[PDB]
Design a protein around this nucleic acid. Structure first.
Ligand SMILES: [Mg+2]
Ligand SMILES: [Mg+2]
Ligand SMILES: [Mg+2]
Ligand SMILES: [Mg+2]
Ligand SMILES: [Mg+2]
Ligand SMILES: [Mg+2]
Ligand SMILES: [Mg+2]
Ligand SMILES: [Mg+2]
Ligand SMILES: [Mg+2]
Ligand SMILES: [Mg+2]
Ligand SMILES: [Mg+2]
Ligand SMILES: [Mg+2]
Lengths: 195, 215, 177, 205, 110, 48
RNA sequence: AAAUUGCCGGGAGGGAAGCGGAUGGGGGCCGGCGAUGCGCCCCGGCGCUCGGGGCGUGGACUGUUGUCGGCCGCGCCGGCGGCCAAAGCCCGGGGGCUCCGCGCCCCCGGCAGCCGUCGUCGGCACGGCCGGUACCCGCGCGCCGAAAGGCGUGCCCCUCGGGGCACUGCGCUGCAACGCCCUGCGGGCUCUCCAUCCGACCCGUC
RNA sequence: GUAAGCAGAACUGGCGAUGCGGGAUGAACCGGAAGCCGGGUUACGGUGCCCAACUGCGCGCUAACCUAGAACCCACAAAGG
RNA sequence: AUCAACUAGCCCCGAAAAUGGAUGGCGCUGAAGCGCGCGACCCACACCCGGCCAUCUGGGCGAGUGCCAUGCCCCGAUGAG
């Protein structure tokens, strides 16, 4: 945990260092596009096109106000493309990821949803993957790791609270005024009121 | 810093320091003592049919109820409930069981030294100097009821026989009131008008919004 | 304090292609409510002008412009293209405001009031601090005088906060401009 | 509109130059919350829209009558007190026991019949014409409407109000006299008590 | 007024019962709605949140020597931007209680 | 709290000038607008 | 037996009544509706049970408060990072406008007080609902302390203040304080009538 | 087919079999699917009264001497001045 | 300082039906209308936590101080017809 935190600040200073250096040297630095998405479903299980119903069943969003963590890649982001009217999604940061894992962390242990209230559950779900504590799980998700598949399929879909303070219109896209689709950085702003 | 207190308490080394395993490394050699098999009663008078459970000695040690920040020995308080609601009294000190101990004084308010729950009082921004008063004589046993037997039903014949007799608060509480009342009046006359103030009772006359009212 | 709009400048380019592996760079000055909305409007314009789509495009940077001197009043001009109910039109609107950002929000509200055009319909061609002695429009140019003076023909009476609000007030209010 | 919350036994309302709909919604919520109102000078209520618009509205209201028994259908009132009372009945659910008990608290009068002459008449700032209409829009007075609709007591109310107004002018001059003497009395006590009364100086004006 | 008879100190602010927590077609009798006299805004009811109230009515039969009755309750949370509160009582109020007075003391004070 | 040398000299003046120079250069390319010399029928309307 | 009718006593009624959910007001009815018994002791005879006193206690229901957890809402404050951060403030310099909103507009360079957005770290105060312990907590095996709690030794860190780490064992382990009433005009009821708010079209059927 | 609350087809969903919150009322429109309860927060829809929520903070437009105008389906109005 | 055309926002004309009549009603005119916003609030059997019922899955309990074993205890999800 000490070293994970140390590289969190190291990377956070490194981004500013690079951007400042690029401005200094004349050009500009393009930030590295996010490796991780947080997707949260915002529309209910009623009146769904069957292909969309399958998309959500595959993403593990089988109930309104569930949250899942997703790898970014052309396979999955074009899967979200097909189902954007039903999800709101974006780029989780460290606080959002860690406090989702702490306050709403459940593990798919033997098909049962075991609360992640102690370090020992991870010894059982993982440990063939060199993930031993909650902080290993948080790091190995956030910095999408060689074992992210297992450390996400271990996680149970986050069963989130209804958005405190309300929610804008769910009918439209976030760009047009609504809530579905990319809100790349602002899933962070939404999570503190889903959670 | 409640969180910092929690961490410092939860540290293993400081748990050692608190539970005092050292000085248990003093008595019983340089190693922690053994425990034994007590309770050799072997004399059960009666065998309960259901699974047996004995009585609890509560091993849990609740935190004392905390006093408000705006309460200092020497404040003038406002009673809220009971027969003395509205009376303005003086907070002497928080007695050991967790309740406030107040005085009228009894000469001016008719409120004796009495025990009042912290919930039902409001602090006032005023202070009196009560460095010179003796209170140590007060405790919980001073107020412990020793309620009599439930074989007495208060009838019509007792209704005013108790009033026309003095078999009531015994004379030493009477005597006590005199000493506290004197030793606190001497310091109440130092503050102007405070005698009239404590003689008055607090009323919420029309157009008075409590949340707007300071205290 | 909070501004409903912000003026960003967004730079993007096509993907590198092994023919012409250094694509040309496009910079645009956009108004939008936040970063993602600015970016999404940016790819709109490059798709309809430079034939560049986001999938075959790349975002280089989004930065937010702020105003030099929020404490000084500036005559602003906005050349804007909008869609009426029956076609498209080109307008010039002059405002006075301490920030271009506030002037743009003023313009969106004024368009939505005078012409029932919603924000999805308005394209801001050009913004320029058109200093005085060059403003073309009566409503702006009539405020260009020292020794300006006028009363408050219209002022609300209302308790300073909600706490003072009563239903019954024995005395008729005294209004005077 | 939540309700004043005042604890008065009755609240008397000087309905001169207030708006019919808004005065009536405020009063209706007072009545529903349980506060007894007495609206006086109901004949002076201002209504937005021209006198011609209100005329046309009220004659459309007149054509509405039950065909097979006219005495049964709409009851088209003419007095300003009754027109306001009907308006408030519009906002109160009058087909429930709560509704009829609500209207029971409502007493509406033309003018100010005693014992409401010797009573401070509270106005509702949420409905005054001065604060609710933009000066320059056409409006009308409920009394002038009802006169043109079939209320035959306009002259009587005018007579009673002119008498009441002069009778109150006399008393108000009496209270000017008493007030100047009491001003003299306040300074008589002020220059009689000095250091004994400094405490009121920083909270007096 | 002067030389009057009645309670000599009021240690409670009056309030009016106003209804129930209701949607357009439901009532939730568990929580009632109360208007405290003198409170006008959402922040100010945060002070009374907790201070218990009393519905004091009076029945037809005399019990324990009095017709007066008391049902007990407290201010749970604000209800809206205009100083209305939600009140929770030991046993749900009669529907006839809406419109009547309620005493709101300051017992659980601070 | 008692005015110790709380944040003191951190960077030399000579590069502290170039950093601000690069900042102003970026802001100039940030607020620069197009010349609008492509719209030969709307030159009068656009003002240039 | 019901349908149905009469009499007596009660109840309520502005063009239906009946029914569901809330309590409230009446009734009518419930003492397993609600307890007085445990431990310690001394006789006085019959270590054990009963008769007497002393003893610490203990009960249905209900109430308030405290403290721990859990969840939750709400308000206040502080620090940091990012932006070219700008700006006002203090100092400097450079342009264009020509009687002009004119002692005007624009721009750059120094500074060392407060002050937007985005991100983040933390502090506090109030309150709601549930829970009250065989495991997580907690208590004893030492002392001081009414108590919150303080107290040992050795190694690392800053070296002020103090901070971090450590050797670790046996056991035990259902949170408390005080009330109200106890045959009462009491308590509460799933029964009856009535009022009030909300809901509510008459069932079987094609 | 002139059009049809018309007849016949394609992909999907709904109703039928379904309550519940909103659209005043409506089988299929909008939200949403359900064991019984307490607490919190919401979706759609709104905050003048009926009716729980602001006569809240802003900016304009409209004056209707025709029932001014006021909810996706929707309960319509045109050509033209 | 002025003239003409063009254009589009609200409003007006265009605009006629039979029981009395329907922005849902009252009413509304620095709106309680129309267009765009900003806070907060109010509102489902929806979402989160907690109690309990049932179903389904997965477990523990014998040289038995041992159990309606068809029983008891534990974990997880779910509940429309
Ligand atoms: Mg809220
Ligand atoms: Mg919404
Ligand atoms: Mg849809
Ligand atoms: Mg029979
Ligand atoms: Mg009849
Ligand atoms: Mg019923
Ligand atoms: Mg009952
Ligand atoms: Mg707590
Ligand atoms: Mg069928
Ligand atoms: Mg609920
Ligand atoms: Mg309301
Ligand atoms: Mg025109």
């Amino acid at each position: 945990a000490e070293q994970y935190a140390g590289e969190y600040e190291a990377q956070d200073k490194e981004l500013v260092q690079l951007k400042r250096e690029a401005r200094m040297k004349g050009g500009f630095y393009v930030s590295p596009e996010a490796k991780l998405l947080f997707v949260v479903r915002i529309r209910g299980i009623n009146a769904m096109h069957p292909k969309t119903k399958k998309i959500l069943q595959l993403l593990r969003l089988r109930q309104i106000f569930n949250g899942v963590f997703l790898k970014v890649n052309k396979a999955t982001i074009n899967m979200l493309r097909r189902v954007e009217p039903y999800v709101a999604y974006g780029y989780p940061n460290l606080k959002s990821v860690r406090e989702l894992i702490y306050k709403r962390g459940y593990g798919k242990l033997n098909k049962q949803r075991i609360p992640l209230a102690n370090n020992k559950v991870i010894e059982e779900g993982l440990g063939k993957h060199n993930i031993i504590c909650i902080e290993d799980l948080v790091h190995e998700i956030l910095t999408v790791g060689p074992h992210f598949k297992e450390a996400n399929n271990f996680l149970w879909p986050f069963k989130l609270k209804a958005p405190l303070g309300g929610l804008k219109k769910k009918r439209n896209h976030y760009v047009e005024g609504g809530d579905a689709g990319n809100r790349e950085n602002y899933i962070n702003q939404l999570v503190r009121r889903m959670n | 810093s409640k969180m910092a207190l929690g961490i410092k308490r939860a540290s293993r080394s400081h748990t050692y320091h608190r539970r005092g395993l050292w000085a248990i490394k003093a008595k019983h050699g340089g190693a922690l003592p053994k425990a034994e098999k007590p309770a050799a009663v072997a004399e059960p008078k009666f065998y309960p049919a259901d699974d047996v459970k004995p009585r609890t000695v509560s091993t849990r040690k609740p935190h004392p109820t905390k006093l408000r920040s705006t309460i200092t020995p020497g404040t003038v308080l406002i009673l809220l409930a009971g027969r003395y609601m509205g009376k303005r009294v003086v907070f002497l000190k928080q007695l050991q069981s967790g309740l406030l101990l107040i005085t009228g004084p009894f000469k001016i308010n008719g409120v004796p030294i009495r025990r009042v729950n912290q919930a039902y009082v409001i602090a006032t921004s005023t202070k009196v100097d009560i460095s010179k008063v003796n209170v140590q004589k007060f405790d919980d046993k001073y107020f412990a009821r020793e309620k009599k037997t439930r074989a007495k039903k208060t009838e019509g014949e007792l209704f005013e026989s108790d009033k026309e007799a003095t078999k009531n608060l015994p004379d030493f509480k009477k005597d006590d009131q005199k000493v506290i009342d004197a030793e606190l009046i001497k310091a109440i006359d130092a503050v102007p008008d405070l005698k009239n103030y404590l003689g008055a009772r607090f009323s919420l006359r029309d157009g008075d919004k409590p949340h707007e009212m300071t205290f | 304090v909070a501004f409903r709009f912000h003026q960003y400048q967004v730079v993007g380019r096509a993907l590198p292609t092994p023919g012409d592996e250094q694509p040309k760079i496009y910079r645009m000055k956009l108004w939008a409510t936040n970063e993602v909305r600015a970016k999404s409007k940016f790819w709109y314009f490059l798709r309809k002008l430079k034939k560049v789509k986001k999938s075959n495009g790349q975002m280089l940077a989004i930065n937010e412009i702020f105003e030099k001197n929020p404490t000084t009043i500036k005559n602003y001009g906005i050349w804007l293209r909008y869609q009426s109910r029956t076609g498209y039109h080109n307008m010039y609107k002059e405002y006075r405001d301490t920030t271009l950002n506030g002037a743009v929000e003023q313009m969106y509200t004024e368009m939505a009031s005078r012409h029932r055009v919603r924000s999805p319909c308005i394209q801001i061609i050009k913004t320029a601090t058109v200093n005085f002695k060059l403003c073309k429009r009566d409503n702006t140019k009539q405020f260009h005088n020292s020794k300006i003076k006028f009363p408050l023909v219209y002022q609300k009476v209302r308790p300073p906060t909600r706490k003072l609000k009563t239903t019954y007030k024995a005395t008729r209010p005294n209004l005077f401009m | 509109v939540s309700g004043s919350g005042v604890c008065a036994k009755r609240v008397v309302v000087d309905a001169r130059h207030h708006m019919l709909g808004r005065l009536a919604s405020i009063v209706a919520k007072e009545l529903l919350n349980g506060q007894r109102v007495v609206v006086v000078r109901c004949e002076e209520i201002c209504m937005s829209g021209g006198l011609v618009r209100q005329k046309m509205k009220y004659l459309r209201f007149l054509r509405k009558r039950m065909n097979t028994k006219p005495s049964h259908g709409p009851i088209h009132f003419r007095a300003p007190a009754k027109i306001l009372w009907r308006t408030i009945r519009g906002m109160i659910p009058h087909k429930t026991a709560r509704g009829e008990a609500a209207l029971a608290r409502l007493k509406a009068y033309e003018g100010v019949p005693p014992p409401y002459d010797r009573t401070k008449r509270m106005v509702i700032p949420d409905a005054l014409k001065v604060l609710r209409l933009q000066p320059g829009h056409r409006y009308c007075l409920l009394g002038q409407l009802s006169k043109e609709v079939g209320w035959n007591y306009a002259d009587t109310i005018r007579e009673l109000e002119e008498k009441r107004k002069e009778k109150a002018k006399v008393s108000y001059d009496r209270r000017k006299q008493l007030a100047k003497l009491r001003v003299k009395a306040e300074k008589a006590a002020e220059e009689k008590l000095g250091t004994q009364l400094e405490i009121l100086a920083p909270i007096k004006y | 007024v002067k030389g009057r008879t009645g309670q000599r100190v009021r240690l409670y602010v009056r309030g009016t019962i106003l209804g129930y927590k209701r949607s357009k077609s439901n009532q939730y009798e568990t929580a009632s709605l109360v208007q405290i006299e003198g409170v006008n805004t959402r922040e100010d009811v945060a002070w009374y949140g907790g201070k218990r109230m009393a519905y004091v009515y009076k029945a037809k039969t005399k019990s324990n020597g009095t017709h007066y009755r008391c049902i007990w309750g407290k201010v749970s949370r604000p209800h809206g931007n205009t100083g209305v509160v939600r009140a929770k009582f030991t046993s749900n109020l009669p529907a006839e209680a809406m419109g009547k007075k309620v005493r709101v003391f300051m017992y659980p004070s601070s | 709290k008692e005015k110790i040398n709380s944040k003191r000299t951190k960077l030399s003046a000579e590069e502290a000038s170039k950093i601000k120079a690069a900042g102003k250069a970026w802001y100039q390319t940030m607020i620069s607008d197009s010349d609008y010399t492509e719209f030969d029928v709307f030159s009068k309307w656009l003002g240039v």
